[PDB]
Each structure stands twice: as C-alpha cells, then as structure tokens.
Amino acid sequence: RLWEVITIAAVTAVVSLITIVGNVLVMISFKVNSQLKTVNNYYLLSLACADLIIGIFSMNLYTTYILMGRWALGSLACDLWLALDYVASNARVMNLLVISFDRYFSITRPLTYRAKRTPKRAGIMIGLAWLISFILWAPAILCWQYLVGKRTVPLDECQIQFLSEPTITFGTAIAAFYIPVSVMTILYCRIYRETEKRTNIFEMLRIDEGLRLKIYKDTEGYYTIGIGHLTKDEAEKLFNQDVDAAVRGILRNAKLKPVYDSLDAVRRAALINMVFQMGETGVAGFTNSLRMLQQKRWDEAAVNLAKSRWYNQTPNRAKRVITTFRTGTWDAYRVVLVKERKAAQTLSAILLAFIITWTPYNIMVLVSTFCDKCVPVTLWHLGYWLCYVNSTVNPICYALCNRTFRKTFKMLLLCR
Numbered sequence: 008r009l010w011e012v013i014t015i016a017a018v019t020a021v022v023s024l025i026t027i028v029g030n031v032l033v034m035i036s037f038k039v040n041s042q043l044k045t046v047n048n049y050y051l052l053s054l055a056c057a058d059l060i061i062g063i064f065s066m067n068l069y070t071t072y073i074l075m076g077r078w079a080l081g082s083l084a085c086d087l088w089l090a091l092d093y094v095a096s097n098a099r100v101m102n103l104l105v106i107s108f109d110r111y112f113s114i115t116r117p118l119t120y121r122a123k124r125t126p127k128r129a130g131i132m133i134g135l136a137w138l139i140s141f142i143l144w145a146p147a148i149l150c151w152q153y154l155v156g157k158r159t160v161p162l163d164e165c166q167i168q169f170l171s172e173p174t175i176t177f178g179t180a181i182a183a184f185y186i187p188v189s190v191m192t193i194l195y196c197r198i199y200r201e202t203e204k205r206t207n208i209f210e211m212l213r214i215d216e217g218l219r220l221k222i223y224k225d226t227e228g229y230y231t232i233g234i235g236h237l238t239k240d241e242a243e244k245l246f247n248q249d250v251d252a253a254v255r256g257i258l259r260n261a262k263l264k265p266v267y268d269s270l271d272a273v274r275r276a277a278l279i280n281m282v283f284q285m286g287e288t289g290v291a292g293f294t295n296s297l298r299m300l301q302q303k304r305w306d307e308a309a310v311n312l313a314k315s316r317w318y319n320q321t322p323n324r325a326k327r328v329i330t331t332f333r334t335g336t337w338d339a340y341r342v343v344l345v346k347e348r349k350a351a352q353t354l355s356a357i358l359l360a361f362i363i364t365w366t367p368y369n370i371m372v373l374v375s376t377f378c379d380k381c382v383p384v385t386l387w388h389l390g391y392w393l394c395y396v397n398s399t400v401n402p403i404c405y406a407l408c409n410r411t412f413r414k415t416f417k418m419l420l421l422c423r
C-alpha cells in the first residue's frame with residue numbers, strides 16, 4: 008500500500024505540475040504576444056483560469072483525500088474544496104458552450120453578430136459563465152445541509168449531500184453534461200459543415216451573407232432565410248436558383264451586360280455579390296465604376312468604389328469585393344476561410360479533450376442510475392481524476408492546433 012501511495016503521489020504531482028506550467032504558459036503567451044489578444048482567445052484565457060484552479064487546488068486536495076483514506080481537514084474545508092471544484096468545472100462547461108455559440112454565430116451571422124464581436128461582449132459572456140456557475144453550485148454545496156435541517160455527510164468522508172440519490176445525480180448529469188455536450192456537438196457539426204468546401208461563389212456569399220436555417224427578420228424587417236433570400240439544411244439548390252436569377256437579370260440589363268461580359272469569372276462573382284447585396288438597379292447606379300471596370304482599370308475602379316455609400320455601410324464586405332475587382336483573385340475570401348478553418352480545428356480539439364476526459368464519470372452516473380450502487384468507488388475515483396486531466400490536456404490542445412500559440416510557447420520555453 009505504501010508503494011502505491013508513493014506512486015500515486017508522484018504521478019499526480021507530475022500531472023499537477025504539467026497542468027500549472029501549461030496554463031501559466033497560456034497566460035504568459037496571451038500577455039506577451041499581441042497577435043494572440045483576439046476575442047476568441049479571451050474565452051481560452053477563462054478556460055486557462057479554470058484549469059489553473061483545477062491544477063493547483065483541486066488535484067492536490069483530491070489526491071491527499073484519496074491517499075489519506077479520509078478527509079482530515081474539517082467539514083468547512085471539504086465544502087469549500089467541493090464548491091471550488093464544481094464551480095470551476097461548471098465554469099469550464101459554460102465557457103465551452105459560449106465558445107461554441109460564438110464560433111457558430113460568427114459563421115452564420117456576419118452583420119448581427121460577427122461585426123459586433125468586441126472583447127467586452129466576450130467578457131460579459133465569460134463573467135456570466137463564472138457568476139452562474141458560482142450562484143448555482145456554491146449555495147447548493149454550502150447550504151443544502153441548512154436547507155434540509157441536518158448534515159448527513161459522514162465525518163470521515165467528503166461528498167455532496169443531494170448527489171447521493173441516483174435520480175438527482177442523473178438529472179444533474181443530463182442538465183449539466185449530456186445536454187451541453189449535445190448542444191456543442193450540434194453546433195460544431197454545423198461549423199464543420201461550413202468548413203469542408205473550397206473557395207467558391209457559395210462560400211463568398213456565405214461569408215458576406217451568413218447562412219440561417221430558420222426564417223428570420225433582416226435589417227429592414229422582411230422575412231428572409233438562408234443566404235439573404237425572401238426552413239431546411241440544403242439551401243445549395245436555392246442558392247443556385249438565386250445566382251441563376253441574378254445572372255439572368257444582369258445579362259438583361261443595359262448597364263450591366265457589357266461589363267459582365269468583359270470581366271473575369273472572379274469579377275463576375277463580385278458583380279453577382281453586389282447584385283445580391285443591392286440589386287440590379289443599385290449596381291446599375293455605379294455607371295462610372297462599371298465603365299472603369301470594363302476598361303480593365305482595376306486600381307482606378309477600386310479607388311472610385313471606395314468613395315461610395317456602399318463602402319461606408321459595410322466596410323469589410325465592400326473591401327473584400329473591391330479587392331476581388333482589383334486583383335482578380337479569391338485571396339480576400341481565402342484569408343477568412345483559412346481563419347475560420349483554424350478556429351474550427353481549435354474548437355474541435357478542446358471539445359474532444361472535454362468529452363473524452365469527462366465521458367467515463369458521466370457514464371458511471373448513468374449506470375449507477377440504472378443499478379443499485381454497482382459502480383465501485385475505485386471507478387468513481389478514476390473517473391473524477393480523469394475529468395481533472397482535461398485541465399492538463401487543454402494547453403497541449405492549444406499547442407497542437409494553433410501555430411501562433413505553438414510559436415509563442417517555443418519562444419517562451421527556449422527563452423528567445
């Protein structure tokens with residue numbers, strides 16, 4: 008048993024040190040590389056805070072508890088450790104949920120969500136995650152004994168009072184793990200479905216006009232759906248019909264036909280994008296720019312289009328379309344596509360780490376719901392510690408799927 012105690016203590020000390028060093032590296036990287044100070048990474052910083060809490064306090068307190076075979080720190084210390092544990096881990100779950108929704112709405116809502124993403128909005132979401140986790144788990148763990156009247160926790164053990172019943176534990180697993188995991192998986196499936204296709208007209212108009220599966224009200228209040236069209240998943244045929252109608256309307260327009268016949272395929276795609284945004288009449292209003300584009304004067308037409316209401320209403324979309332006219336390449340949209348693909352890979356890595364490390368404990372909860380104390384305490388301990396290991400593996404996720412994080416980590420480690 009002594010050999011076992013030494014081995015467990017050594018392994019868990021090593022794992023705790025790796026967790027601490029990794030999340031401190033994440034924080035130092037966020038601090039000393041301005042290229043990492045993006046809206047996406049503030050959520051990752053929140054995750055690193057939860058993981059550092061897990062690595063310093065949770066791992067060491069839990070391992071001392073299991074090695075001593077009892078709790079020898081007092082009931083208040085047990086309740087404080089359990090509260091810290093459950094609040095920080097629920098905060099991690101909420102942070103993963105808000106990361107999922109942030110990425111999803113960035114992909115699907117460019118005007119209503121993506122153009123409005125500031126670090127303060129992200130900080131609101133982060134603080135709400137932490138505050139809701141706190142007000143849900145700390146009062147329960149600390150005052151359920153006062154709610155029932157008596158404290159039915161054994162003096163030598165450290166467990167939460169109400170989570171002994173299998174039905175309450177099952178409800179907690181459903182509302183706290185299974186429903187969040189289902190939501191994150193559905194959101195990631197949608198994000199991934201929008202990251203398989205190469206750079207084309209569909210992806211261009213999706214970047215400019217996000218894809219919505221449900222009928223919504225546009226900026227003017229009209230019932231639009233899909234890619235700016237006025238409830239399904241295969242809107243590709245609808246998109247083809249709309250771009251077919253757009254080409255047919257451009258070819259039947261006096262000001263748009265010669266320029267459309269003279270432009271490259273990429274520039275015809277830019278013209279179709281402008282027709283999608285404004286219409287045939289709106290694009291026909293740019294007679295000067297159309298004559299500049301028909302005469303292959305790309306720089307002149309670009310600087311002429313940068314002086315319109317279209318450039319001031321939507322700066323990013325107009326800049327991309329103007330760059331497409333000016334260069335005749337997809338690079339302005341290629342850049343957004345590779346950025347979104349990188350974000351998606353990072354999201355998938357952190358989601359898989361979470362799901363893999365936390366799945367055994369919650370499967371044990373399910374089995375214990377459908378049996379009578381059949382899951383041994385050894386397995387409970389292993390599943391608990393495995394959920395801790397999420398906090399250890401998350402910085403390795405950042406290092407394996409973000410080249411900026413990887414470069415900053417190598418700079419810090421080698422002390423460059």
Ligand SMILES: C[N+]1(C)[C@@H]2C[C@@H](OC(=O)C(O)(c3cccs3)c3cccs3)C[C@H]1[C@@H]1O[C@@H]12
Nearest residue numbers: 092093096097176179180183184391394395
């Ligand atoms: C190792 N933990 C620190 C403890 C045990 C695990 O708990 C979980 O996986 C559970 O689904 C459940 C525990 C009991 C019933 S359902 C969650 C609890 C809070 C959010 S999700 C993971 C985390 C969480 O802080 C608890």
Ligand SMILES: CCCCCCCC/C=C/CCCCCCCC(=O)OC[C@H](O)CO
Nearest residue numbers: 049094126127129130131133134137138141
């Ligand atoms: C334990 C229960 C705690 C209950 C909740 C109390 C704490 C809430 C704090 C939220 C800070 C999040 C806001 C900061 C996140 C990003 C916003 C921002 O702009 O931060 C810029 C700066 O660079 C970043 O250090």
Ligand SMILES: CCCCCCCC/C=C\CCCCCCCC(=O)O
Nearest residue numbers: 143146147148150151154179182183
């Ligand atoms: C998505 C995460 C879901 C989190 C689920 C939280 C589980 C809540 C379980 C029990 C809380 C019961 C109400 C506690 C009241 C606090 C004061 C008291 O204990 O009397």
